[PDB]
């Protein structure tokens, strides 16, 4: 089966890390962090890696139950909740995974909303307020199966009833809100486990070529980004199409449907990342109606032409 | 954010072999890949040898036959094995897991009568 992208324009695109449309194709040369996200993470073959999973739905999002308010002399209220897989089956700490699969995996304040249906009724209660999970806290440690999170709201948060997060943003960037994206949480709260590697570009001259979408603030200053690998349709194609791929590196193009131009070249790493042959950083001005598509395997020293 | 540290390096003879060695601050098994560079005084780092994580391989032209990189089943290392060295193997020769990581000191190859 011979390998293929989806024909999907930037504006057709999501958000692997965060809930969030894609807004910019982004290059960053000068950043010497360690890239080694967890969600948005897929081999070329159609293997997830890391925390990935398909839904759209699960990316940042967990589902379980709160146990118990939990003592916090900090403003805001505190609760210890247990989490489940996204399926609502019982999560195994032992399985050969990093933390439930959609568990974000970046350093930040998480803001989203809490939300309850009980069980008991004939029609259950409900109740939903805003919620901030705060990923590097002692706390989070959801391949254990727990975490916490804080809530403006006092008292309305029950306990042992079906409760689901929906992600929104980040409640702050500031100094003291420790947002790092190429931070990894500590998911044991301990060594992290079968994490999907970390990426690199190879060949000298080469940057990584990320999908870019800003995400929102519950507050404060600060334009904060998610970059993410490859977008949520492309994970989803990869593992639709499962084809085998010929070679470490696919070259792919950029191209303008409009006048079949190609903008310009990129390598797709096996492992499922980009480069690009760009020296500068920021966001990439390239043509809206532009998309990706699969030339040929080569290997990890073809030279790209510069964009 | 990796801290490199490469050696082994030295003087030896046209059709000699070395053996380099490269440890990292991290587990090399986590990085999707390790590489060789080399630099040849005046010219521009280039790219020698590659690995990933379950063992596949490539390598430059000019190498391919001669070099083989691996890596330490007991150690976090990797290694460079070179064989056949011939005058214009001489460079600086470098490892990373990729380009955007600050390089380590190198360690200098001359092969040379």
């Known amino acids: 089966k011979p390998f293929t992208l989806p024909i999907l324009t930037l504006g057709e695109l999501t958000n692997s890390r965060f809930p969030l449309p894609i807004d910019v194709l982004y290059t960053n040369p000068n950043e010497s962090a360690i890239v080694q996200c967890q969600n948005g993470r897929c081999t070329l073959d159609g293997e997830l890696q890391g925390t990935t999973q398909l839904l759209p739905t699960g990316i940042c999002a967990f589902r379980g139950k709160v146990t118990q308010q939990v003592q916090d002399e900090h403003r805001g209220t505190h609760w210890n909740m247990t989490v489940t897989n996204l399926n609502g089956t019982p999560f195994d700490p032992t399985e050969d995974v990093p933390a439930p699969l959609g568990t974000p995996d970046f350093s930040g304040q998480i803001y989203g909303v809490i939300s309850q249906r009980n069980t008991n009724t004939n029609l259950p209660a409900n109740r939903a307020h805003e919620a901030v999970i705060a990923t590097y806290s002692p706390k989070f440690t959801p391949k254990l199966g727990n975490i916490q999170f804080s809530t403006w709201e006092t008292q309305d948060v029950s306990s042992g009833q079906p409760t689901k997060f929906t992600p929104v943003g980040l409640a702050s960037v500031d100094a003291n809100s420790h947002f790092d994206q190429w931070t990894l949480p500590s998911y044991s709260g301990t060594l992290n486990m079968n994490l999907a590697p970390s990426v690199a570009p190879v060949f000298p001259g080469e940057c990584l070529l990320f999908f870019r979408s800003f995400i929102p603030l519950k507050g404060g200053y600060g334009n904060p980004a998610i970059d993410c690998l490859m977008p949520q349709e492309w994970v989803q194609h990869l593992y639709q199409e499962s084809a085998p791929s010929l070679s470490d590196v696919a070259l792919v193009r950029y191209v303008n449907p409009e006048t079949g131009r190609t903008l310009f070249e990129a390598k797709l790493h096996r492992n499922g990342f980009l480069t690009v042959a760009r020296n500068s950083a920021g966001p990439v001005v390239a043509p809206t109606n532009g998309y990706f598509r699969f030339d040929s395997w080569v290997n990890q020293f073809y030279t790209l032409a510069p964009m | 954010d990796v801290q490199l540290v490469e050696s082994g390096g030295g003087l030896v003879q046209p059709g000699g072999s070395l053996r380099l060695s490269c440890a990292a601050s991290?587990?090399?098994?986590?990085?999707?890949?390790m590489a060789w560079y080399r630099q040849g005084p005046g010219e521009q780092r280039e790219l020698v040898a590659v690995?990933?994580?379950?063992?596949?391989?490539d390598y430059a032209d000019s190498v391919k036959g001669r070099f083989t990189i691996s890596r330490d089943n007991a150690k976090n290392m990797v290694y460079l094995l070179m064989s056949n060295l011939r005058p214009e193997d001489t460079a600086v020769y470098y490892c990373?897991?990729?380009?955007?990581?600050?390089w380590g000191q190198g360690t200098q190859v001359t092969v040379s009568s």
């Open positions: 990373n897991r990729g380009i955007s990581n600050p």
């Open positions: 991290e587990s090399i098994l986590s990085f999707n890949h």
């Open positions: 690995i990933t994580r379950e063992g596949s391989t």
